[PDB]
Design a protein around this ligand. Structure first.
Ligand SMILES: [Mg+2]
Ligand SMILES: [Zn+2]
Lengths: 612, 1340
DNA sequence: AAAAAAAAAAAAAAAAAAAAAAA
DNA sequence: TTTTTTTTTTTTTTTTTTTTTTT
């Protein structure tokens, strides 16, 4: 009875078929806010059934319970109203299948749709990692009032903009919203509405909707920015600024605090996340949720109105491709002939061959990236001039919507030298992009790398699973149980130098984490910040301005606590920003953060380069 | 030329390379194997003949009684296929074996047998295989997927020792036999050869050789050559071999022949060796100290007293040299020692050899195989012989022998299936050679060494197992055999063989339930090559050298097609042209190339034979003579690829698609596609549900036709002629006169298959695709199957798509769909379920199927019948009773007063609990059929008798109508004969059909033919009567069921799902998607002249996950529908042939370089009009996979229609009415509807049925189950502070009955509150521990 | 002899022997 | 030079069909 699977020690760990559960296939949910989960009718009248009974018998529509049951099973119109009332605010928990992250059990409010598919806000499709190609999520509910308050406070989808592991947001515009934003703000040298001064953003939207001025139109407007220059005060300044009509239109969605220049570039996937993060740090949380909703909506709408579509003719191939490949073929011909004469050994010949193939591949990649990018020569109302192109493939790649330069290179340039199944690089590469056809030999070669990649991913799945399990097995012990251990032995953090390639400055690896000793400016006897102080962003900026190369930071690796870890000695929670409150387990935060990003993991003389 | 069915719709084809070997008959690997299994083989080399003659003859030990096998025969099956589907039994047939038993007298072994006997005794029943290569074993088609495994033979595998942190290579030889016990050898890290028979406790490799009766001197001579020596004065002279001096240095001054060849310290350079050979330098003086390092070769014994001076395998010490010198041993022959080329590792093995006695090695083996047993000479010898030498317990099959002989470079191709001394000796020889830098190693993932085992071989294997078992029983009985008092029926027993074979074809990992939800799924699941199964690589033990793709898969196994996920690359498919070599190695066809002339004659090459020559890739051009236009033509070689000269080519491929499989060659523009997405596309196509009305794909590959024809579900004709009578359930074909039999032709009666359930709930409906009176040629398509359209396979449907990101609803990969696609209802399947209700007889009386049920309203009983079974065509819904079933109120309960009641019998009119089988919650349906099955000895009730009478009357009708139609054909033939001779019209038509032979006819063969036809008529009457009686008997007799069941009634629900916002459509290039919304017709974006668009996919799925094939498919589809619209416009104006014929000819030409070359001039303009009618909604375009259709051709084809060359059109936005800037693509991507249907996925749960012992909510979609709250979700909650929700996921919603009830009370009462307190599980555990003497108390 | 119920479908413990160190 | 102690490396032990039991 105390042994084996039926052993009553390891019984609540194997797995419990919890009630009030659910399932469904998933469907995109634009028109939802960022804290709403479209739940089906046919599944929301079989989850909140007892709640419906309660609010029904209490209202007296059917006092006796069996009458209430027979009413709900009768689909009477009143039960829809009662169900709407009960689900008015009754958070549900949507859980994806492999729950590596701690975001994988986020909880939303319900809004009822018809049909049968658990809708799901697009932006929150990243933490889940779902892809809307058959992914299925389970709906649990919290019954007891404490559990309701937890699902609304600790887990609601609008209180987890920042993922546990990495501080920066994980509600980041992803696939079409960024393409829409990118299109909505791009500098076109000459188009309708060029050369004029309209008004603030309102007349810009009026101009665009009427069709008078094209969306891309370098034009001056009068945006006014409320910058927080004064101490916690919206200081407003307005002035005629150059922009694009589309940029002025998008500026209406930015909240008050941000400066205008936050949106004057051609917003990619990078600048958009930077804008969202800046909105977080400057104006707190709730404006960031409002602004994420607004950016998603005003991205989808203008992506649609753009109609960016991938015609085949927009995967332009260089005209120099065949010439470069002929030159490479001549090169390998001469090298092979020389090897046959014995002047160069077999290994050297092979290495030279692959090197010249790499060189030719680089040439072709540069040529195609130059044809795709730029290459759009158009009149500016005077003579001609070139601007960054609008080809849908290049527009995607520059925007970073989905597909970086490598893949479009594979679409138009030579698709490289595929390594043989062992791993040795094939001497004769694939000399045909995808737009032109492959050959049976070339395609049969590509299958090698393809299948090896698939199998290695399938194995690394379970590999990362085992690693997470070990980590959470040895980390679950901890829990932040001490406000302050009052130590002095914190490690001294410095920028990390990868053999002359310092990548992480002191910014990140000391961000938030609490200093042990008072930060001393390099100027003598000049204490920069006191001892036990939190290193939030402004103090980090002070560190940058003073450029401190080493600061002593408290570390959980040695905190004077009996069975936990000091709150101060841990730092910021890196899921909410403020110092970790007493209790929030960090072991099963850590284990999972050092877990989930595992499957992504792949399975003579010094020349001084800087002044010093 | 084109047959009628072909001429119905000519598929425009863009192919360039002229086919020389058309696509073979798919499923050949299955039918050929099975016909090999059952067919009576006179030579008996393979099949049941081989197994019988292997197990036979039989005789008990000194029994003077020999049992011999005469012949075998496979009688007719008791049932036929269709009633086998209906009933549920195997589609098996008896297996009658003619055996003969003969017995002699005493002291007369060679004397004449005193008594004999012979009989055709029943020998088990064997499953058969239908015409589609499937087995109907339990009312369902099970397919025996052929397996792939390491072939029998020897494989000197390096086995790279990545362990030991040393890089040393532990060369391994493995003599794998087809049947027996293995035998492998390997070098240990200490350079000592070791053996582990069947992977038990390792032994020194020498042991078997000294267990083989080889003396140590013999062992040394076999493994090692020797060096001769002679005592000749001081510094004894030894035979110098300059060749042996290779790879050696002069340890002493080599000053022979009066010349200083090599001074001490210098190597023996090739100059010095050549000088030695030139002068014939031979045995010369050498130092004794130099010889001291040698090893004695033989066992030198002092001849003076015959005392062993030293056995061999010992180093030479100068004292031993002097001792043998005094004894007169002039010869000091030593084993030739070296390491660079002749490393004597087996000498070290002999040193490690614990013993030398033959019996000692036998004892070693005896303990090795069976540890701890009492050692014994006789048993040890028997073990040693039977492990390898005895045929019964060891057999390298002929494939094994061939591979073994070829691996050892033997001149011979055929030999005995057992090993021998020289076999293992040569294996050891080559093993040490390889370790000595002589010979590479084999890689098991090279298809020469892999082998393909079909159904027939597996059946023969299991049947041989059964045969040896029954033979053992036969010997058992014969040893106790009585004198001629029993014939070969007591000695025999059919049960073991039948049980074994039905266990195999049934419960085995290679008898999977056939994947029938599409013709392509069926044919792919047949042609499958699995690496799993018995004697194979389990899906976790296999590593990565087999999940990879070897460079000989080309032409033998499709790289693209394979399931992904857990077992990727273990389940390879088969190429379209691949076959199986006579031994069973995957061959492939190649075009013979004599000089520049690529001769169209075709040669089939195995795996190894491919490397010996140089092959040209399929799409290498020619110049109308077979000469390669490009002289330095690209070609492939022994795993290589280079530009070989025009004459350095010995073979060329047959076609541009022999690298792929049908499961992935249906993909169009497969060349312009990444391998990952083509793989996922092939997997998707394999599982596409067959929609309501089949729609010919608008962009095919020319392989859909053959796949559909040869798949099996297309009701292909048998003889040409005319279609006498079409119908929704039957086609009768009047045979063309030439093809008629010698008598009684004019009858096909193709019984189409009206609606019936498939193996995944998809209607298998066959419709007739021939107009009445239309002629039909042999082998054409009379009736479209599920997902077929005039023969062409049609998996999904067209759908005018426009790649553009609409307002979000296609965000990640989602897919809009206009209401039109669901309004006109072009995606709508006909899933047909099968609910089975049974009536067992448990304790306390039988189960009753009466309509009488307690605690049920009149509404439930309204639609039932009196018996308790719903009427056919009853539009049931959720909760309605399909079958009224009840049980007799539990069991013996209450108290002994209850036993008193049972003695008096209870007093309950009901006295029965309700156990009726209702519709599962959430499914509608219209009942099609309700079959009833009865255990023998159970009288059929009202519903049963109703169905019985119905089926009997229908069968009477069927036999009557087939007899009538055949009689009509016979009398039509009689009338045709009577046209010439006896042509009296008035006399003929006056009298009735009673007598049409009494008419006048002179002495001619015509009246003899009429007499033959009359005999046929009377035979038809009698045969009809006998068939009628047999069918009546089969219908009436009750069918045996599982034990304890009186009767079972099975009802087939039929439902009509509809495309809805959770399904999963998907294109063919792996571009999945879940339908995200069903918009109104307006909100969709419409092109310039009004027509909306029926899908709006997401463009950003193209650039990454590179599958730009689908864009080319969209464009070419747009051009196809463009030509279709042009033809439709011409027809609507009722244009006159010339316009049509011209336009169609022009469209079909399009032939800068093509192979169609069709001509509509000689096309019988009526048939041109029919062609226009069949093309008026699209001009189907083919595009063979790698000989595709170039872009410029697509531009021209679009230009033939008025559509723009770009392939993009301006789309207006429906909701606003403005223009989308940035013009957008619009074409016809042939989209599927995979059967991941939302309403089979979604599954709610509040307080449904709970579990048995776990007492948790019952899990499983089939029983209203809630999603599993596994561990990782528990961690997910722990990371959050959320604790009460976890504590309630564990206790108040898993097992706490009191907590469950209390929480329900609070929720209904309007209070949201758990009850604080330790879960009772803690209390149960606490009492469990307290059961043991453990305090286990609590604390504060 | 037939029918019904139970269960099957590499890690580490111990010890022999080789080598180090102390008398 | 011999004995004893310690190390380490080798070996061996730990949902369906069929079998055994019962009537
Ligand atoms: Mg997915
Ligand atoms: Zn601390």
């Amino acid at each position: 009875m105390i042994k084996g699977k039926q052993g009553r020690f390891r019984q609540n760990l194997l797995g419990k078929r919890v009630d009030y559960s659910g399932r469904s296939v998933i469907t995109v949910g634009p028109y939802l806010r960022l804290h709403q989960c479209g739940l089906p009718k046919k599944m929301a009248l079989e989850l909140f059934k007892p709640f419906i009974y309660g609010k029904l018998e209490l209202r007296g529509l059917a006092t006796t319970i069996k009458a209430a049951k027979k009413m709900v099973e009768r689909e009477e119109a009143v039960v829809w109203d009662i169900l709407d009332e009960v689900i008015r605010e009754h958070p549900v928990l949507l859980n994806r299948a492999p729950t590596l992250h701690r975001l994988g059990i986020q909880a939303f409010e319900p809004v009822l749709i018809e049909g049968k598919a658990i809708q799901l806000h697009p932006l929150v499709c990243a933490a889940y990692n779902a892809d809307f190609d058959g992914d299925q999520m389970a709906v649990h509910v919290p019954l007891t009032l404490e559990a309701q308050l937890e699902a609304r406070a600790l887990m609601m989808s609008t209180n987890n903009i920042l993922s546990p592991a990495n501080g920066e947001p994980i509600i980041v515009p992803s696939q079409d919203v960024v393409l829409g934003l990118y299109y909505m703000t791009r500098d076109c040298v000459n188009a309708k509405g060029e050369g004029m001064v309209l008004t603030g953003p309102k007349e810009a939207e009026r101009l665009y909707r009427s069709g008078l001025a094209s969306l891309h139109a370098r034009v001056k407007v009068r945006i006014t920015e409320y910058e927080k220059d004064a101490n916690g005060e919206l200081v407003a300044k307005t002035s005629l600024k150059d922009t694009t009509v589309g940029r002025a239109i998008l500026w209406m969605i930015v909240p008050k605090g941000l400066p205008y220049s936050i949106v004057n570039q051609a917003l990619g996937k990078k600048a958009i996340s930077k804008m969202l993060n800046t909105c977080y740090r400057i104006l707190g949380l709730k404006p960031t949720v409002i602004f994420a909703d607004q950016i998603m909506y005003t991205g989808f709408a203008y992506a649609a109105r753009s109609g960016a579509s991938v015609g085949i003719d927009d995967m332009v191939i260089p005209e120099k491709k065949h010439e470069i490949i002929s030159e490479a073929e001549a090169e390998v011909a001469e090298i092979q002939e020389q090897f046959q004469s014995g002047l160069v050994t077999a290994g050297e010949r092979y290495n030279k061959v692959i090197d010249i193939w790499a060189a030719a591949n680089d040439r072709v990649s540069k040529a195609m990236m130059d044809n795709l990018q730029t290459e759009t020569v158009i009149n500016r109302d005077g003579q001609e001039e070139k601007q960054v192109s609008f080809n849908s493939i290049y527009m995607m790649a520059d925007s970073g919507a989905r597909g970086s330069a490598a893949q479009i290179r594979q679409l138009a340039g030579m698709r490289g030298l595929m390594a043989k199944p062992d791993g040795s690089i094939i001497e004769t590469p694939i000399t045909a992009n995808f737009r032109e056809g492959l050959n049976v030999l070339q395609y049969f070669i590509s299958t090698h790398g393809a299948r090896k990649g698939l199998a290695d991913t399938a194995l690394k799945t379970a590999n990362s699973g085992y690693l997470t399990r070990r980590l959470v097995d040895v980390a679950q012990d901890l829990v932040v149980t001490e406000d302050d251990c009052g130590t002095h032995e914190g490690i001294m953090m410095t920028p990390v130098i990868e053999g002359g390639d310092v990548k992480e400055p002191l910014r990140d690896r000391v961000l938030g984490r609490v200093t042990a000793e008072d930060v001393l400016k390099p100027g003598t006897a000049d204490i920069l910040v006191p001892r036990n102080t939190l290193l939030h962003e402004q103090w980090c900026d002070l560190l940058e301005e003073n450029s401190v190369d080493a600061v002593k930071v408290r570390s959980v690796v040695s905190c004077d606590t009996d069975f936990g870890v000091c709150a101060h000695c841990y730092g910021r929670d890196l899921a909410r920003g403020h110092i970790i409150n007493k209790g929030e387990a960090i072991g099963v935060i850590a284990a999972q953060s050092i877990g989930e990003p595992g499957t992504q993991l792949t399975m003579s003389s010094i020349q001084v380069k800087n002044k010093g | 030329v084109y047959s009628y069915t072909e001429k119905k719709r000519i598929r425009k084809d863009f192919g360039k390379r002229p086919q020389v070997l058309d696509v073979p008959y798919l499923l050949s690997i299955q039918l050929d194997s099975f016909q090999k299994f059952i067919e009576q083989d006179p030579e008996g080399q393979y099949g049941l003949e081989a197994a019988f003659r292997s197990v036979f003859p039989i005789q008990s030990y000194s029994g003077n009684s020999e049992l011999q096998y005469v012949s075998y025969r496979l009688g007719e099956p008791v049932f036929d296929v269709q009633e086998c589907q209906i009933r549920g039994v195997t589609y098996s047939a008896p297996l009658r074996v003619k055996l003969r038993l003969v017995i002699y007298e005493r002291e007369a072994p060679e004397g004449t047998v005193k008594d004999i006997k012979e009989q055709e005794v029943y020998m088990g029943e064997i499953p058969l295989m239908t015409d589609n290569g499937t087995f109907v074993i339990n009312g369902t088609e099970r397919v025996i997927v052929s397996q792939l495994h390491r072939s029998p033979g020897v494989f000197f595998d390096s086995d790279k020792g990545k362990t030991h942190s040393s890089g040393k290579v532990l060369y391994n030889a493995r003599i794998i036999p087809y049947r027996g016990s293995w035998l492998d050898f390997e070098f240990d890290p200490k350079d000592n050869l070791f053996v582990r028979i069947d992977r038990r406790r390792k032994l020194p490799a020498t042991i078997i050789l000294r267990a083989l009766n080889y003396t140590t001197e013999q062992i040394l001579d076999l493994f090692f050559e020797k060096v001769i020596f002679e005592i000749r004065d001081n510094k004894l002279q030894m035979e110098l071999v300059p060749e042996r001096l290779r790879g050696e240095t002069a340890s002493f001054d080599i000053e022979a022949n009066g010349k200083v060849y090599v001074e001490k310290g210098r190597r023996i350079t090739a100059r010095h060796i050549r000088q030695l050979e030139k002068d014939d330098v031979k045995l010369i003086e050498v130092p004794v100290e130099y010889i001291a390092g040698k090893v004695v070769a033989k066992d030198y014994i002092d001849e003076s007293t015959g005392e062993l001076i030293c056995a061999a395998n010992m180093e030479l010490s100068l004292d031993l040299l002097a001792k043998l010198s005094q004894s007169g041993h002039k010869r000091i022959e030593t084993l030739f020692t070296n390491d660079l080329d002749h490393g004597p590792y087996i000498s070290e093995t002999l040193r490690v050899d614990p013993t030398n006695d033959r019996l000692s090695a036998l004892v070693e083996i005896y303990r090795m195989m069976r540890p701890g047993e009492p050692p014994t000479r006789e048993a040890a010898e028997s073990l040693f012989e039977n492990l390898f030498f005895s045929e019964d317990r060891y057999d390298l099959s002929a494939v094994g022998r061939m591979k073994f002989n070829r691996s050892l470079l033997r001149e011979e191709i055929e030999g005995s299936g057992i090993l021998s001394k020289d076999d293992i000796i040569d294996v050891m020889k080559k093993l040490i050679d390889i370790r000595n830098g002589k010979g590479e190693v084999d890689d098991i993932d090279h298809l020469g060494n892999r082998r393909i085992r079909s159904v027939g071989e597996m059946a023969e294997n299991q049947f041989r197992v059964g045969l040896v078992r029954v033979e053992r029983a036969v010997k058992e009985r014969l040893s106790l055999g009585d004198l001629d008092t029993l014939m070969p029926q007591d000695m025999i027993n059919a049960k073991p063989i039948s049980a074994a074979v039905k266990e195999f074809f049934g419960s085995s990992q290679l008898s999977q339930f056939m994947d029938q939800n599409n013709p392509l799924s069926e044919i792919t699941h047949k042609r499958r090559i699995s690496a799993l199964g018995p004697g194979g690589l389990t899906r976790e033990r296999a590593g990565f050298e087999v999940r990879d793709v070897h460079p000989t898969h080309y032409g033998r196994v499709c790289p693209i097609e394979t399931p992904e996920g857990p077992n990727i690359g273990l389940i390879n498919s088969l190429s379209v042209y691949a076959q199986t070599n006579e031994y069973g190695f995957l061959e492939t066809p190649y075009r013979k190339v004599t000089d520049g002339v690529v001769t169209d004659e075709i040669h089939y090459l195995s795996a190894i034979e491919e490397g010996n020559y140089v092959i040209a890739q399929a799409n290498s051009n020619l110049d109308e003579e077979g000469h390669f236009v490009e002289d330095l033509v690209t070609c492939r070689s022994k795993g290589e690829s280079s530009l070989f000269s025009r004459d350095q080519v010995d073979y060329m491929d047959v076609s541009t698609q022999q690298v792929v499989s049908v499961g992935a060659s249906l993909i169009p523009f497969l060349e312009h596609d990444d391998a990952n997405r083509a793989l996922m596309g092939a997997n998707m196509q394999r599982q596409a549900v067959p929609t309501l009305r089949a729609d010919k794909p608008l962009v095919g590959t020319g392989m859909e036709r053959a796949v559909a024809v040869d798949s099996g579900v297309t009701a292909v004709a048998k003889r040409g002629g005319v279609v006498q009578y079409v119908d929704a359930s039957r086609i009768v074909i009047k045979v063309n006169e030439d093809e008629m039999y010698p008598g009684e032709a004019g009858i096909d009666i193709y019984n189409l298959t009206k609606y019936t359930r498939s193996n995944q709930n998809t209607c298998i409906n066959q419709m007739p695709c021939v107009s009445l009176g239309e002629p039909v040629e042999r082998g054409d398509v009379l009736a479209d199957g599920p997902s077929t359209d005039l023969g062409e396979l049609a998996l999904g449907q067209n759908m005018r798509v426009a790649f553009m990101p609409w307002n979000g609803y296609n965000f990640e990969d989602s897919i809009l769909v206009s209401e039109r696609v669901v309004q006109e209802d072009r995606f709508t399947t006909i899933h047909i379920q099968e609910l089975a209700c049974v009536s067992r007889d448990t304790k306390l009386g039988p189960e009753e199927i009466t309509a009488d049920i307690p605690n049920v309203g009149e509404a439930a009983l309204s639609k039932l019948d009196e018996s308790g079974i719903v009427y056919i065509g009853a539009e049931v819904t959720g909760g309605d009773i399909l079958v009224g079933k009840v049980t007799p109120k539990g069991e013996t309960q209450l108290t002994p007063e209850e036993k008193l009641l049972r003695a008096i019998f209870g007093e309950k009119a009901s006295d029965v609990k309700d156990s009726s089988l209702r519709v599962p919650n959430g499914v509608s349906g219209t009942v099609i059929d309700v079959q009833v099955f009865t255990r023998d000895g159970v009288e059929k009730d009202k519903r049963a008798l109703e169905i019985e009478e119905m089926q009997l009357k229908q069968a009477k009708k069927d036999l009557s109508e087939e007899l009538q139609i055949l009689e009509a054909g016979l009398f039509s033939r009689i009338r045709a004969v009577l046209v010439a001779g006896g042509v009296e019209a008035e006399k003929l038509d006056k009298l009735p059909r009673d007598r049409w032979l009494e008419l006048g006819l002179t002495d001619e063969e015509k009246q003899n033919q009429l007499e033959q036809l009359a005999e046929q008529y009377d035979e038809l009457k009698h045969e009809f009567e006998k068939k009628l009686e047999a069918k009546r008997r089969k219908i009436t007799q009750g069918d045996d069921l599982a034990p304890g069941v009186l009767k079972i009634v099975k009802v087939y629900l039929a439902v009509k799902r509809r495309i809805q916002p959770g399904d999963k459509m998907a294109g063919r290039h792996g571009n999945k998607g879940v339908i995200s919304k069903i918009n109104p017709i307006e909100d969709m974006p419409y092109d310039e002249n009004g027509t909306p668009v029926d899908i709006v996919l997401n463009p950003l799925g193209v650039p990454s996950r590179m599958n730009i094939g689908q864009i080319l498919e969209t464009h070419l589809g747009m051009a196809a529908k463009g030509i279709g619209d042009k033809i439709n416009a011409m027809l609507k104006q009722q244009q006159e042939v010339a316009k049509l014929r011209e336009f169609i000819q022009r469209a079909y030409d399009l032939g800068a370089d093509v192979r169609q070359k069709v001509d509509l001039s000689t096309f019988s303009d009526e048939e041109v009009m029919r062609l226009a009618e069949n093309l008026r909604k699209g001009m189907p375009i083919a595009t063979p996979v790698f000989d595709g259709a170039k872009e410029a051709e697509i531009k021209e084809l679009l230009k033939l229609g008025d559509l723009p060359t770009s392939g993009q059109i301006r789309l207006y936005d429906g909701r606003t009415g403005e223009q989308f800037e940035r013009p957008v693509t619009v074409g016809y991507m042939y989209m599927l509807k995979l059967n991941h249907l939302v309403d089979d996925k979604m599954h709610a749960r509040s307080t449904g049925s709970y579990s048995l012992v776990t007492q948790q909510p019952l899990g499983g979609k089939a029983q209203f189950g809630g999603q599993r709250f596994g561990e990782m979700e528990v961690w997910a909650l722990e990371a959050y502070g959320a604790a009460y929700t976890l504590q309630e996921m564990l206790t108040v919603k898993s097992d706490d009955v009191n907590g469950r009830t209390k929480m329900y009370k609070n929720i209904v009462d309007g209070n949201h509150q758990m009850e604080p307190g330790m879960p009772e599980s803690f209390n149960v555990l606490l009492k469990e521990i307290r059961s043991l003497g453990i305090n286990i108390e609590l604390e504060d």
